[PDB]
């Protein structure tokens, strides 16, 4: 029914936000099978920054309370080709993260698996009929690795792996 | 004055790890990422993944994920990688390597600078 | 992706054409190495056409798209490598070049 991010500190209530879009990296490499991989992206703060869909809320991975697309999904990159560019999703309609002040945010499952169909979907326009799969984040940084955002004066680290692991056709 | 100065050349059991350093002078680290190449002798050239120097962040090749783990220590600027379960065909020689910038943005994969490259022999 | 031809011999002074093909149309994304026998690759074309700063000018390179060339003007002896086209994490299989004398 919902996703659960573990955070640390624990966010409260009053930090819930509203999911605009994300930012991601696609794995290189020969496949071997008719799919593309796509995890949270292995950038920094500039392919962030280039992005230009953020609002008020300093976050990596996924972006908080930023501004929506007008009519569905749309993702830019600079290269579609170079896998070393990030991927940014700016979404049309917003997933509300709910965090309960213990420790843990919580996304619905039907919201996230519908968004992530539209994310699937609009990638296939880029890279063709192949299966479209979302894994975990590929190591990296705390900051980085996890879902990070400040809310109210604290910077706060959730894990995001419960969010990228599907497959789609 | 840009150079890449790699470990030495080592042998490792089949089915074991090793870790292979490059250590980076003459510019600044975390302005560029750090890609790995392979080449198994008398073979052609096989790219491995990048990592990015101000996150951590890495994307390997498919082949290799779940087997290859890339870290970095900006303090003395040095890439590592290390690849664990070792097979025959994983003989060759370890080359990291960076871009030097296009002039007009074309060059994200053209690696001017490379190491030395780091001999690994997998045999019992 | 594709190289041709596998290998080839030339004479000083002669004309030398590498050929590589990419299976998407990369623009002028493309790259060429020269690897000498004993050392790493060496970078002599990025951007299908342009120099390398230093290389001498009987290197030079062309294509856009799909079809892209690699041409030695005029062979010189030190000019004996294996030569790979590269777009982003593909490495062509290299065309090695020696000499007939």
């Known amino acids: 029914d919902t996703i659960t991010l573990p955070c640390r500190p624990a966010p409260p209530p009053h930090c819930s936000s509203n999911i605009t879009g994300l930012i991601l990296t696609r794995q290189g490499g020969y496949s071997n099978a008719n799919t593309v991989i796509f995890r949270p992206s292995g950038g920094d703060w500039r392919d962030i920054a280039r992005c230009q869909i953020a609002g008020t809320v300093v976050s990596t991975q996924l972006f908080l309370n930023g501004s929506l697309a007008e009519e569905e999904v749309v993702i830019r990159s600079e290269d579609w080709r170079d896998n070393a560019k990030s991927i940014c999703v700016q979404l049309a309609t917003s997933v509300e993260i709910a965090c309960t002040g213990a420790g843990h945010c919580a996304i619905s499952r039907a919201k996230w698996a519908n968004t992530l169909k539209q994310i699937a979907s609009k990638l296939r326009e880029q890279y063709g009929a192949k299966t479209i799969i979302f894994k975990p984040s590929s190591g990296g940084d705390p900051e980085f690795v996890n879902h990070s955002f400040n809310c109210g004066g604290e910077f706060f680290y959730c894990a995001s792996t419960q969010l990228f692991a599907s497959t789609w056709f | 004055q840009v150079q890449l100065v790699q470990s030495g050349a080592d042998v490792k059991k089949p089915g074991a790890s090793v870790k292979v350093s490059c250590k980076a002078s003459?510019?600044?680290?975390?302005?560029?990422?750090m890609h790995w190449v392979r080449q198994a002798p008398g073979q052609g050239l096989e790219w491995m993944g990048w990592?990015?120097?101000?996150?951590?962040?890495?994307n390997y090749a498919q082949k290799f994920q779940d087997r290859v783990t890339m870290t970095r220590d900006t303090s003395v600027s040095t890439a590592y990688m290390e690849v664990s379960g070792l097979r025959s065909d994983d003989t060759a020689v370890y080359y990291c390597?960076?871009?030097?910038?296009?002039?007009?943005?074309?060059?994200?994969?053209?690696?001017?600078?490379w190491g030395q490259g780091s001999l690994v022999t997998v045999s019992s | 992706m594709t190289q041709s031809p596998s290998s080839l011999s030339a004479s000083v002074g002669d004309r030398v054409t590498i050929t590589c093909q990419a299976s998407?149309?990369?623009?002028?994304?493309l790259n060429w190495y020269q690897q000498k026998p004993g050392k790493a690759p060496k970078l002599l074309i990025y951007?299908?056409?342009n120099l390398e700063t230093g290389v001498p000018s009987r290197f030079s390179g062309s294509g856009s798209g799909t079809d892209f060339t690699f041409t030695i003007s005029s062979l010189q002896p030190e000019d004996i490598a294996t030569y790979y086209c590269?777009?982003?994490?593909?490495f062509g299989p290299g065309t090695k070049v020696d000499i007939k004398r």
């Open positions: 003459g510019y600044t680290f975390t302005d560029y990422y």
């Open positions: 390597a960076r871009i030097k910038l296009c002039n007009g943005g074309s060059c994200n994969w053209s690696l001017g600078y």
């Open positions: 590269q777009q982003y994490e593909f």
């Open positions: 998407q149309d990369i623009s002028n994304y």
């Open positions: 990592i990015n120097p101000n996150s951590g962040g890495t």
């Open positions: 951007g299908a056409s």
